[PDB]
Design a protein around this ligand. Structure first.
Ligand SMILES: [Ca+2]
Ligand SMILES: [Ca+2]
Ligand SMILES: [Cl-]
Length: 131
């Protein structure tokens, strides 16, 4: 679930505010995206979206017609470390892992505040590079 993803971000990056910080950043950090990623953190967000695309192609997820953004899963946070409950079903487990990979990628990527709230219409028009 989207709110859970943001919780994962807070876990890996306690020093941040998932919404104000990682939403409306670059061309892909936020709901969907387009164009060419502006930087490493932006690439993390692009990758994340493609992860959700892959999820929808999983057998289990297909049958569930599950929506990555609203599908809830079980996770726990421990000292900056994220854990996706092994009891989540295969689809839920793939979605949680997508979010987990994203959160970790964010934590490693440098944050460039000038990439915040870019004009998608004058910096992101076009198609994604991958997926
Ligand atoms: Ca996005
Ligand atoms: Ca669920
Ligand atoms: Cl598509």
């Amino acid at each position: 679930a989207l709110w859970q993803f943001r919780s994962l971000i807070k876990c890996a990056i306690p020093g941040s505010h998932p919404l104000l910080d990682f939403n409306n950043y670059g061309c892909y950090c936020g709901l969907g995206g387009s164009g060419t990623p502006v930087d490493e953190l932006d690439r993390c967000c692009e990758t994340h979206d493609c992860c959700y695309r892959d999820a929808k192609n999983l057998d289990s997820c297909k049958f569930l017609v599950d929506n990555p953004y609203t599908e809830s899963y079980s996770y726990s946070c421990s000292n900056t470390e994220i854990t996706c409950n092994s009891k989540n079903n295969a689809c839920e487990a793939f979605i949680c892992n997508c979010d987990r990979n994203a959160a970790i990628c964010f934590s490693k990527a440098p944050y460039n505040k000038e990439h915040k709230n870019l004009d998608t219409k004058k910096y992101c028009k076009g198609e994604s590079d991958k997926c």
